[PDB]
Design a protein around this ligand. Structure first.
Ligand SMILES: [Cl-]
Ligand SMILES: [Cl-]
Lengths: 218, 218
């Protein structure tokens, strides 16, 4: 297919403000919560590969898409850098890893991973967290939540042992484990191949083992 | 609901010879190709849970299924051990991993995974291999094949980089990657979210694309 050019560029897209990301691209994504009220989108890589990404903001959502019929020899060097003052949702349906390396403070965060790649969120501070992992890859979470709903359905692990939550709702239906941390309550259901491990001494627990694996307090 | 008993048993079923497995059970399966002409089926678990598994051999197929008329509270560890002189097919629609740890020599092998769990086949020697993955899980394959048809439609990877085949037919329509090894020819079609990676220097290649990912020689 398309031979990536030797001219490595950064394309800056002055997009409208958004609080949600919906991406069907190839390449790693790095999200930063802005501290100066700015919204920005930068795409780094070979100029003829960067040119394949279509960008639009609609209903407070940043949509990143590609012409799926386009053959590319390789997607090496592709880096998508996203920044906005707020973030409430990530819907990922491409190939690559999604990062929040330096924190996110939000009320509600909804993570929907339906692609090939990992999700790694560090220093998260939220009220409600909802994770639906449905693709191939791991979802790594660190920080705090009042409520954390962790639902794994694809192939991979939810690594949320360092995500301190008061109430946890965990269900494992694919292939992989859920590691979590519940200080007050835990509703855990094993329904696939894999186990649910939880830190803490929750007052209320509701456990259901209906697959291949176990529920263990660690 | 049935409470699993504390009496863990192994039940031995002296079944008729079969060359196909069709299982809709909960629990890991371990298949062994016998070298002494024997056919055997053993099921390990709580005795009142083992008693829920329906076993029948019909037209050379071992059928394993759950009597779903009796609700079960919690599942405890289950293990299904299967042995026969030959194996030409595995159809899985339950919950659990399917293993062939110590090899299989066959003419044609047909793998149909519709459930939740992995398929891990080591030291495979066959003429024709057909894999149709439609559930949640990975299909891991090692050994040799003259022809390998690898069709992924669910969520998970086909890990066949150590399966040396002369001709490969690979298509990915779900979420996940196909890693394979084609020495003479490769027909590859990316139609979902994920990539097709192939080892070798095939003489003939046909590469088709309408998805999110790529086709790469590794
Ligand atoms: Cl963890
Ligand atoms: Cl592999």
């Amino acid at each position: 297919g398309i031979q990536p050019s030797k001219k490595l560029i950064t394309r800056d897209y002055k997009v409208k403000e958004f609080n949600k990301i919906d991406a069907g691209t190839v390449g790693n994504i790095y999200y930063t919560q802005s501290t100066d009220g700015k919204t920005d989108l930068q795409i780094y890589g070979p100029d003829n590969i960067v040119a394949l990404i279509q960008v639009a903001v609609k209903d407070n959502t940043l949509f990143l898409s590609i012409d799926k019929s386009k053959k590319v020899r390789n997607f090496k060097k592709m880096k998508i850098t996203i920044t906005s003052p707020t973030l409430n949702g990530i819907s990922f349906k491409g190939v690559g890893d999604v990062h929040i390396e330096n924190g996110l403070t939000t009320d509600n965060l909804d993570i929907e991973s339906k692609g090939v790649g990992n999700v790694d969120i560090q220093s998260l501070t939220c009220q409600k967290l909802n994770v639906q992992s449905m693709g191939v890859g791991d979802v790594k979470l660190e920080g705090t939540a009042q409520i954390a709903a962790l639902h794994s359905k694809g192939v991979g692990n939810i690594e949320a042992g360092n995500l301190r939550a008061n109430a946890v709702e965990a269900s494992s239906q694919g292939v992989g484990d859920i590691t979590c941390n519940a200080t007050e309550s835990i509703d855990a259901a094993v329904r696939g191949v894999g186990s649910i491990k939880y830190k803490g001494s929750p007052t209320i627990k509701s456990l259901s083992k209906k697959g291949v694996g176990t529920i263990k307090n660690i």
